[PDB]
Design an enzyme around this catalytic site. Structure first.
Site, PDB file in Angstrom:
ATOM      1  N   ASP A  40       0.839  -1.192   0.000  1.00  0.00           N
ATOM      2  CA  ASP A  40       0.000   0.000   0.000  1.00  0.00           C
ATOM      3  C   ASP A  40       0.876   1.243   0.000  1.00  0.00           C
ATOM      4  OD1 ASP A  40      -2.155   2.046   0.807  1.00  0.00           O
ATOM      5  OD2 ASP A  40      -0.885   2.011   2.606  1.00  0.00           O
TER       6      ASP A  40
ATOM      7  N   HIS B  68      -7.656  -2.097 -10.510  1.00  0.00           N
ATOM      8  CA  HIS B  68      -7.811  -1.024  -9.545  1.00  0.00           C
ATOM      9  C   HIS B  68      -7.100   0.259 -10.007  1.00  0.00           C
ATOM     10  CE1 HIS B  68      -8.549   1.079  -5.940  1.00  0.00           C
ATOM     11  NE2 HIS B  68      -7.300   1.029  -5.474  1.00  0.00           N
TER      12      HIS B  68
HETATM   13  C1  HEM Z   1     -10.282  -2.912  -0.579  1.00  0.00           C
HETATM   14  C2  HEM Z   1     -10.061  -1.689  -0.911  1.00  0.00           C
HETATM   15  C3  HEM Z   1      -8.824  -1.228  -1.510  1.00  0.00           C
HETATM   16  C4  HEM Z   1      -7.630  -1.885  -1.673  1.00  0.00           C
HETATM   17  C5  HEM Z   1      -7.216  -3.260  -1.202  1.00  0.00           C
HETATM   18  C6  HEM Z   1      -6.798  -0.959  -2.380  1.00  0.00           C
HETATM   19  C7  HEM Z   1      -5.487  -1.277  -2.716  1.00  0.00           C
HETATM   20  C8  HEM Z   1      -4.656  -0.468  -3.405  1.00  0.00           C
HETATM   21  C9  HEM Z   1      -3.340  -0.824  -3.790  1.00  0.00           C
HETATM   22  C10 HEM Z   1      -2.672  -2.134  -3.495  1.00  0.00           C
HETATM   23  C11 HEM Z   1      -2.810   0.234  -4.437  1.00  0.00           C
HETATM   24  C12 HEM Z   1      -1.437   0.313  -5.076  1.00  0.00           C
HETATM   25  C13 HEM Z   1      -0.370   0.924  -4.191  1.00  0.00           C
HETATM   26  C14 HEM Z   1      -0.495   2.408  -4.019  1.00  0.00           C
HETATM   27  O1  HEM Z   1      -0.138   3.139  -4.914  1.00  0.00           O
HETATM   28  O2  HEM Z   1      -0.898   2.868  -2.947  1.00  0.00           O
HETATM   29  C15 HEM Z   1      -3.842   1.235  -4.466  1.00  0.00           C
HETATM   30  C16 HEM Z   1      -3.689   2.460  -5.027  1.00  0.00           C
HETATM   31  C17 HEM Z   1      -4.661   3.418  -4.990  1.00  0.00           C
HETATM   32  N1  HEM Z   1      -5.903   3.330  -4.498  1.00  0.00           N
HETATM   33 FE1  HEM Z   1      -6.651   1.807  -3.623  1.00  0.00          FE
HETATM   34  N2  HEM Z   1      -7.466   0.146  -2.635  1.00  0.00           N
HETATM   35  C18 HEM Z   1      -8.667   0.106  -2.175  1.00  0.00           C
HETATM   36  C19 HEM Z   1      -9.679   1.044  -2.221  1.00  0.00           C
HETATM   37  C20 HEM Z   1      -9.568   2.302  -2.740  1.00  0.00           C
HETATM   38  C21 HEM Z   1     -10.594   3.294  -2.802  1.00  0.00           C
HETATM   39  C22 HEM Z   1     -12.005   3.139  -2.265  1.00  0.00           C
HETATM   40  C23 HEM Z   1     -10.028   4.385  -3.412  1.00  0.00           C
HETATM   41  C24 HEM Z   1     -10.610   5.700  -3.733  1.00  0.00           C
HETATM   42  C25 HEM Z   1     -11.855   6.014  -3.542  1.00  0.00           C
HETATM   43  C26 HEM Z   1      -8.675   4.033  -3.728  1.00  0.00           C
HETATM   44  C27 HEM Z   1      -7.776   4.859  -4.314  1.00  0.00           C
HETATM   45  C28 HEM Z   1      -6.481   4.500  -4.663  1.00  0.00           C
HETATM   46  C29 HEM Z   1      -5.551   5.441  -5.358  1.00  0.00           C
HETATM   47  C30 HEM Z   1      -5.759   6.869  -5.768  1.00  0.00           C
HETATM   48  C31 HEM Z   1      -4.415   4.761  -5.552  1.00  0.00           C
HETATM   49  C32 HEM Z   1      -3.184   5.296  -6.219  1.00  0.00           C
HETATM   50  C33 HEM Z   1      -3.310   5.022  -7.723  1.00  0.00           C
HETATM   51  C34 HEM Z   1      -2.120   5.519  -8.510  1.00  0.00           C
HETATM   52  O3  HEM Z   1      -2.062   6.717  -8.715  1.00  0.00           O
HETATM   53  O4  HEM Z   1      -1.259   4.734  -8.903  1.00  0.00           O
HETATM   54  N3  HEM Z   1      -8.481   2.774  -3.322  1.00  0.00           N
HETATM   55  N4  HEM Z   1      -4.922   0.769  -3.838  1.00  0.00           N
HETATM   56  C1  LIG Z   2      -6.059   2.382  -1.661  1.00  0.00           C
HETATM   57  N1  LIG Z   2      -5.631   2.378  -0.643  1.00  0.00           N
END
Ligand code: HEM
Ligand SMILES: [C-]#N
Ligand code: HEM
Ligand SMILES: [C-]#N
Ligand SMILES: [Mg+2]
Ligand SMILES: [Mg+2]
Lengths: 298, 299
Positions: free
Chosen positions: B142, B214
């Site tokens: 994360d 995602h």
């Molecule tokens: C079970 C729920 C979720 C999981 C397991 C999850 C997991 C992840 C993972 C593994 C990453 C990649 C690592 C990182 O760059 O931080 C990521 C990126 C991200 N997640 Fe989530 N996420 C979840 C929910 C959400 C939700 C609800 C949002 C927004 C409403 C969100 C927004 C983002 C954003 C903005 C990134 C960065 C994307 C980028 O610019 O590369 N995530 N998430």
């Molecule tokens: C997405 N944390």
């Protein structure tokens, strides 16, 4: 030879899992060997955690696994005080402790993967050491707990015979009513415990009530203290249920039982003053075999 | 003009989130909020080692009352997204506490409950913890593309001028992971679901991963400008019971968060986030976190 979770001191976090055997009791033999190997793997990966763990068994299951040999004092946890202390005896206890809650979580997941659907998890409690190593009541807890490996081994670990390296375990979850505690003046809380609250000084035995916690549990038999090794920790949410997850290890179940008979009115008809603000809601006795005994299960 | 202490800190290992409804008169929140932010300062002085921060934030209905309708123009009750795929559980008050010490967070949570007293009905209390290698419980790292350093985090999360200067919009959503369902997926399928490799945490190119991944759902740009948010999410739960991610994000504009939700839950292009295969959201709420001076000026 002793399981790694009995003797470590000053753990910051713990996980206790209590479960019943759904399957064949033989499922516990392979699972227990897998789990103790996982513990060694986690200790090698996170040496800074000071991780330890214990797998312990309830009377019925242990009698089967041991063929009725040893663990002479083991029995189902009875009620004490005719029901004041309830009984929730299960078949398996897993106790994981370390300096790092996140490592304990990975170890708990490995325990559940090892035992699989052979068990039905009844309780899972996440303990945490609170500010200044105080109980949530605000009293320091561990001052008279055996200190150093030498004394802790003397108190907790069976010395000889078939059970050498093993220990008896007692677990009991308490639910604190901090609103009821806060209605008490600090001097009344101090007479309830038997120690001063801020400075944590013992109130002399002749100057505190016989119902004070220390008067109930600091027991001697012709001057020899009935000592136990406590591994308890606070648990819960601020808005929901919280209290102390009481956990103790002893080379004899007798020392623990005498303290319970005293606290719950069975010995002299007097009850622990802490019952004014907190209550026990679970209770179980388990036998923690030695690591060699676990390896000799299959 | 001062930001609440819990928005910007990075790398905090532990957090407590409390979500609650107001039982009686909204006036009760005024003194309670002042008492609580004073308690936060007291705890920071007592445990300088903790690196403690906290945020008090308010739902649409109560913030409109406390502010007299001035500012917080984007604030609204959290709607359902994907016609119900993302449920809505909008409450009146959010308390977010984070630090390097769970035990200090616990004392701060107790002080928050003592301050608000019986004026609130606690609906949720979640204890977040950073897991091994900063990974989500799914086993993916994360935080890699989360804004880094105070300067960029302030640019993304903190309102720069006007009556709301120093404030932020907050979004909270608790997810329940089904790890058994995740583990039925091969590692390459989990990687295409996320859009990053699992062990090495390398981004899979945008043209080589599904549009449902995602990263494809939430790495959104408007003419090349990223719709950034500051995430403060943490894993939570028990190994044998419910566990997952407590999603928490701060943004100077509620818009960035909403565009990501419309994308993830099928409202924008009819496609939904591939993570719905093994995890689901079960709560959802939007809140407005005023600046510290606006909390001090509640009266
Ligand atoms: C079970 C729920 C979720 C999981 C397991 C999850 C997991 C992840 C993972 C593994 C990453 C990649 C690592 C990182 O760059 O931080 C990521 C990126 C991200 N997640 Fe989530 N996420 C979840 C929910 C959400 C939700 C609800 C949002 C927004 C409403 C969100 C927004 C983002 C954003 C903005 C990134 C960065 C994307 C980028 O610019 O590369 N995530 N998430
Ligand atoms: C997405 N944390
Ligand atoms: C709500 C439950 C309990 C609370 C809050 C509590 C709290 C305390 C406190 C504050 C102390 C003094 C600090 C120390 O020396 O560790 C203490 C000591 C002790 N407690 Fe407890 N206790 C509880 C339950 C129990 C139970 C169930 C047992 C045994 C079955 C027990 C056995 C002991 C013993 C042996 C000592 C040390 C006494 C001495 O030798 O001075 N406690 N407890
Ligand atoms: C007593 N613990
Ligand atoms: Mg003594
Ligand atoms: Mg990108």
């Amino acid at each position: 030879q002793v399981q790694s979770g009995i003797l470590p001191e000053h753990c910051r976090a713990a996980i206790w899992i209590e479960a019943n055997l759904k399957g064949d009791v033989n499922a516990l033999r392979e699972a227990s060997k897998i789990f103790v190997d996982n513990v060694a793997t986690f200790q090698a990966k996170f040496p800074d955690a000071k991780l330890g763990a214990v797998v312990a068994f309830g009377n019925n299951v242990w009698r089967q696994l041991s063929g009725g040999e040893g663990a002479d004092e083991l029995k189902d946890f009875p009620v004490y005080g005719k029901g004041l202390a309830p009984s929730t005896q299960y078949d398996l206890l897993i106790h994981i402790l370390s300096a790092r809650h996140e490592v304990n979580f990975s170890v708990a997941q490995a325990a559940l993967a090892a035992f699989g659907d052979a068990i039905d998890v009844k309780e899972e409690i996440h303990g945490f050491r609170w500010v200044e190593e105080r109980d949530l009541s605000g009293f320091v807890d561990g001052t008279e707990n055996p200190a150093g490996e030498e004394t802790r081994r003397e108190v907790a670990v069976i010395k000889d015979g078939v059970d050498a390296g093993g220990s008896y375990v007692f677990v009991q979850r308490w639910e604190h009513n901090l609103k009821q505690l806060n209605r008490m003046s600090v001097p009344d809380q101090e007479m309830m415990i038997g120690r001063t609250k801020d400075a944590n000084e013992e109130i002399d035995g002749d100057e505190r009530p016989v119902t004070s916690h220390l008067s109930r549990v600091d027991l001697k038999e012709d001057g020899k203290g009935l000592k136990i090794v406590r591994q308890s920790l606070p648990y819960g949410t601020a808005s929901g249920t919280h209290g102390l997850y009481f956990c103790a290890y002893c080379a004899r179940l007798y020392n623990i039982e005498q303290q319970l008979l005293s606290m719950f009115g069975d010995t002299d008809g007097k009850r622990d003053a802490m019952l004014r603000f907190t209550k026990p809601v679970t209770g179980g006795y388990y036998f923690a075999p030695s690591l060699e005994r676990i390896q000799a299960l299959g």
